Design a protein around this ligand. Sequence first.
Ligand SMILES: O[C@H]1CCC[C@@H]1Nc1ncnc2[nH]ccc12
Ligand SMILES: [Cl-]
Length: 167
Amino acid sequence: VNSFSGYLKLTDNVYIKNADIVEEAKKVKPTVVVNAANVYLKHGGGVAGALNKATNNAMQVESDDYIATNGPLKVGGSCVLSGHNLAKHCLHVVGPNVNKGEDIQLLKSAYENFNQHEVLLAPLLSAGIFGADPIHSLRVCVDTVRTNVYLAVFDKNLYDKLVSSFL
Ligand SMILES: O[C@H]1CCC[C@@H]1Nc1ncnc2[nH]ccc12
Ligand SMILES: [Cl-]
């Protein structure tokens, strides 16, 4: 039993809700919140900009030190950093950005990072301003993640579309 509330159950391990991931994180304080990161951990917009804003830019400060030490992530890769005031940990995961020409096949690799954590609050990778089809992202999530994932979908219209079209 966990404290996630109001989710629709899609499969044995995947749950979905129309919610602002920032407000959800502040309520649940999950062990792991997933960020929709880029390889530079430059948290400018979308989920990343919103999460970082909610940390008062502490996420960005921590991320800049991470990059200065380690260099950029790989597309499809991840790193674990602090969750600041939102969660114990933030798993920064880089899905391919279609608006940069990146290989959509890398979306499965991106979701594989979730399997290193027993429970996660997460967005749909590569959706939104990353330019992929969210229906496809949900399908890859369900077919790749085996741990317990609670998906927050900001856009109510998209949420309803994702539920109604889910196979
Ligand atoms: O699932 C994500 C992945 C792409 C579209 C969805 N959008 C959001 N859902 C919830 N909170 C959010 N805060 C900022 C953006 C956002
Ligand atoms: Cl977005």
